[PDB]
């Protein structure tokens, strides 16, 4: 669940 | 002569075969009842903290106040989130006010390509950071809901071990239910002893026959004395069969006691089964909260690094925005004045 939370790339 | 010893080996083999039959029957019954009832005293284990959970508690103490620092770090990440949102809102307000003034200016009279093109780049770059910010909005929100979901157990796992052990459910059995457990445990003990003595008594009978075939055959030799000698050996065999028959007969009274105890055990059995279900349930939420703690450490770091990079870009875009909008307004001041 919370393991697959990805922040965007910049 | 050779036929008298052969007739006696058949009589010894027959009584041994009748013995092995009565034993297999009694064991068949006995095994079916054990398998059908499925039946222990490890109730103190509920009062112990599993070793794997203690290793996780100790891991939350090798670094002091790790749950407190994670909670604070989450508040910092929540803080820079709202800061970014507010700077993105400031840039929007500047673009909206500038676009309004430009429409009013182009109405009051019939510009500058450079500032127009810089103002268009600010708009493009703003919408880029708006799309990236709203994308990471659900992620940030889920990260904080997960934190709130597990922080109570993480505080529990960080505190003293006695409060962890107190969170686990313990058996609360009345003296009547303990008696039902003791009586059931006493009968099962009697069943096992009955099994052991049965195996033992059969071995003795087999060894008594085996030793008689080593003696009155493999070394010695008789004549017409085979009649009295076979009666001597047969007397020894019959005394063991008496003990074995007592062992077989005793099984019937014991099975009646066990099935009756099993009926009294039915209420205790469900209570203890619900206690085991509940015990492993609370244990698995503690394990899950520790697993979430590792994932939170990782994602909290990724979020603070992402939003720090994003805050720096949005702060720098806000500078370009207010500079471009201020210059464009000074141009409208000069032009509309000389009119």
Author numbering:
A (entry chain B): 262 to 271
B (entry chain A): 5 to 43, 48 to 118, 123 to 351
Any passages from the paper?
HD-PTP (His domain protein tyrosine phosphatase; PTPN23) is a non-receptor tumor suppressor phosphatase (Kok et al., 1997, Toyooka et al., 2000) that regulates several ubiquitin-dependent endosomal trafficking processes such as downregulation of EGFR and PDGFRβ signaling (Doyotte et al., 2008, Ma et al., 2015), recycling of Src (Chen et al., 2012, Lin et al., 2011), and degradation of α5β1 integrin (Kharitidi et al., 2015). HD-PTP drives the degradation of mitogenic receptors by coordinating their sorting into the multivesicular body (MVB) via specific recruitment of different endosomal sorting complexes required for transport (ESCRTs) (Ali et al., 2013, Stefani et al., 2011). The CC domain of HD-PTP is solely responsible for the interaction with UBAP1, and residue F678 in this domain is essential for binding (Stefani et al., 2011).
In order to define the molecular interactions, we determined the crystal structure of HD-PTPCC in complex with UBAP1C at 2.5 Å resolution. Only residues 262–271 from UBAP1C were clearly identified in the electron density maps and the side chains of I263, L266, F268, P269, and L271 are in direct contact with HD-PTPCC. The binding interface in HD-PTPCC is defined by three hydrophobic pockets and the conserved FYX2L motif plays a critical role in the interaction. Pocket A is large and shallow and accommodates UBAP1C residues I263 and L266. Pocket B is deep and narrow and accommodates UBAP1C F268 and P269. Pocket C accommodates L271 and includes V504 (H4) and L682 (H7). Upon UBAP1C binding, E514, D667, and K671 side chains are displaced breaking the K671-D667 salt bridge and opening the A pocket. K671-Nζ then forms hydrogen bonds with the C=O groups of I263, K264, and L266 in UBAP1C.
